[PDB]
Amino acid sequence: GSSGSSGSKYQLGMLHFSTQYDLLHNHLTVRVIEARDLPPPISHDGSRQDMAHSNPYVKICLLPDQKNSKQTGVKRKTQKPVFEERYTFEIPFLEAQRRTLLLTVVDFDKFSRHCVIGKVSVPLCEVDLVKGGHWWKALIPSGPSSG
């Protein structure tokens, strides 16, 4: 029970990620991939700020659980955050299917307020984890949730 989005497209950007579940280890293997088309460090507004480079980072989480969130190391001044790191999560397939892979892209810096650039949610119910996942999505403008 929440509002939707309809109108001016969202040119927030795009993030690369792959969702694969390991049967041998019986855990969720979520490897974080690089990204591109990410907006500069801005609070209110302002075109491509000059000489504006910070240390961005990507977070991880498995909905509906939005408490135990993970985060990749902090890279050096760069527009395209790339880590190519792998992660694990002891979760029973049965649950996995019900759970959802959500990735949040937030910048890290002194005056780096909680102005997340965008998020990317994807249900692991349809996708085949046992076989692994790998696609490209366009970050969406997160919003309020009463659930």
Curated annotation (Swiss-Prot):
Sequence intervals crossing the membrane: none
Localization per Swiss-Prot or TrEMBL: Membrane
Domain C2 span(s) in chain numbering: 11-137
Tissue-wise expression: Expressed abundantly in brain (frontal and temporal lobes, hippocampus, hypothalamus, amygdala, substantia nigra, and pituitary), kidney, and prostate. Expressed in fetal brain, kidney and lung. Expressed in melanocytes.
Domain of life: Eukaryota
Assigned protein family: Belongs to the synaptotagmin family.
Protein role: Plays a role in dendrite formation by melanocytes.
Name of the molecule in the record: Synaptotagmin-17
Taxonomic classification: Eukaryota, Metazoa, Chordata, Craniata, Vertebrata
Gene name in the database record: SYT17
